[PDB]
Structures are given as structure tokens and as C-alpha cells.
Design a protein around this ligand. Structure first.
Ligand SMILES: *[C@@H]1O[C@H](CO)[C@@H](O[C@@H]2O[C@H](CO)[C@@H](O)[C@H](O)[C@H]2NC(C)=O)[C@H](O)[C@H]1NC(C)=O
Lengths: 49, 46
């Protein structure tokens, strides 16, 4: 935010006044998420009689 | 960040030497470590 004002007057009346204001703001956000799960079950059976 | 590792391997190899009843004690080892009393008596009779 920025603002400037200037005024000058001198009688011989004459009066002059100038004001300037400029405001600018920017917001940026980002969100990333990842989830991975692996489940493996290996069962082997062998029987001889 | 969270990570979890789970690994459990349990294997059993029963040896019951009761001709037909020999396979019963071997098959019963799946999830049952302790031998059945009635099955043990049947194998003893065999
Ligand atoms: C964005 O930031 C917010 C901060 O509050 C995160 O919100 C929580 O983050 C914690 C971190 O582990 C989680 O346990 C909560 O479940 C979150 N709450 C909600 C309502 O989301 C958020 O995870 C971040 N990421 C996004 C929103 O994608």
C-alpha cells in the first residue's frame, strides 16, 4: 500500500492540491497430498500322506 | 509424512507318523499351534 499527497497555495489567490493512492496485494496458496498403501499376503501349503 | 511396515510370517510343519489320522494333526496346524486333546487321543489309538 502506498499513498502520496501534495498541496501548494500562494496568494498573489491560487490553490492547488493533488493526492495519489495505490494499493495492491496478492495471495497465492497451494496444497498437494498423496497416500499409497500396499498389502500382499502369500500363503503356500503342501501336505503328503 | 507417516510410514508403517508390517511383516509377520509363521510357518509350521507337523509330523504325525495312525495312517489316516496322520494327516489330521498335520492339517490342524493351520492357525492352531496347540494339538487337540481328542485328536491326540484318536492318533494315539490309531
Ligand atoms: C492445508 O493446510 C491445512 C492446515 O490446517 C491442513 O489441514 C490439516 O492438516 C493436518 C496435518 O496432518 C491434518 O491432520 C488435518 O486432517 C487437516 N485438516 C483438514 C480439515 O484438512 C491440510 O491438510 C492442508 N492441505 C490441504 C487442505 O490440501
Amino acid at each position: 500500500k502506498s499513498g502520496f499527497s501534495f498541496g501548494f497555495k500562494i496568494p498573489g489567490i491560487f490553490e492547488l492540491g493533488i493526492s495519489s493512492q495505490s494499493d495492491r496485494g496478492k495471495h497465492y496458496i497451494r496444497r498437494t497430498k498423496r497416500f499409497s498403501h500396499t498389502k500382499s499376503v502369500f500363503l503356500h501349503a503342501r501336505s503328503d500322506l | 509424512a507417516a510410514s508403517g511396515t508390517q511383516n509377520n510370517v509363521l510357518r509350521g510343519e507337523p509330523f504325525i507318523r495312525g495312517a489316516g489320522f496322520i494327516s489330521g494333526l498335520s492339517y490342524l496346524e493351520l492357525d492352531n499351534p496347540a494339538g487337540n486333546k481328542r485328536r491326540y487321543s484318536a492318533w494315539a489309538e490309531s
